[PDB]
């Protein structure tokens, strides 16, 4: 696992995506901290969202555990920062890297699935009143992600 994790870290040092950063804090390669900037022209714009990453010891055969530590208003992410996303469970691929996973999560921010949600109350509002949804997510970004 370590060698693969070291290659991904070097890649992030040389060519990170615009939206996302991640790395260990000490020498512990199995635990990373990450950030995603809210995409421009979204309710999340101008926010920085922190996540925690735990690599299992049989990485990359098994997915990393990824959770938000910054509160975010979204139908597929709950108040514990849990992200109900299939590439984090049954649709993981060993060819995915942390960089690609953060980019995928970032693309989930503006493409939620309200039809099968993790947080029902937020999906109802997303379907029945998009403006209120945008209002609220914007307020949450200002309150917690800034």
């Amino acid at each position: 696992a370590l060698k693969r994790i070291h290659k991904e870290l070097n890649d992030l040092a040389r060519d990170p995506p615009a939206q996302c950063r991640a790395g260990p804090v000490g020498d512990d390669m199995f635990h990373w901290q990450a950030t995603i900037m809210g995409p421009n022209d979204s309710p999340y714009q101008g926010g920085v969202f922190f996540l925690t990453i735990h690599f299992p010891t049989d990485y990359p055969f098994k997915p990393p555990k990824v959770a938000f530590t910054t509160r975010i208003y979204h139908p597929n992410i709950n108040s514990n920062g849990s992200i109900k996303l299939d590439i984090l469970r049954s649709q993981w691929s060993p060819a995915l890297t942390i960089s690609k996973v953060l980019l995928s999560i970032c693309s989930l921010l503006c493409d939620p699935n309200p039809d099968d949600p993790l947080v029902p109350e937020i999906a109802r509002i997303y379907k029945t009143d998009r403006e209120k949804y945008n209002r609220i997510a914007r307020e949450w970004t200002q309150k917690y992600a800034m």
């Binding site: 691929s93 060993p94 060819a95």
Partner: protein
């Protein structure tokens, strides 16, 4: 329609994308196509656990140990 040059796989000498150590000789076959980006050791581990191809998710028909004469 413009002339298309052949292009050759310069990434073929990079190590297996899973273990980052061994050469890419474990070809993942599905239908009439193959994705060659892992060593035989790492690709057999996927096949032995009936995991799909990492880059296209098609089911792994077979792993082919690939020699380059």
């Amino acid at each position: 329609e413009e002339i298309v040059e052949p292009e050759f796989p310069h990434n073929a000498i990079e190590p297996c994308v899973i273990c980052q150590t061994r050469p890419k000789n474990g070809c993942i076959v599905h239908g009439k196509t193959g994705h060659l980006m892992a060593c035989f050791t790492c690709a057999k581990k996927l096949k032995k656990r009936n995991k799909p191809c990492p880059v296209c998710r098609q089911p792994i028909q077979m792993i082919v140990l690939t020699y380059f004469p």
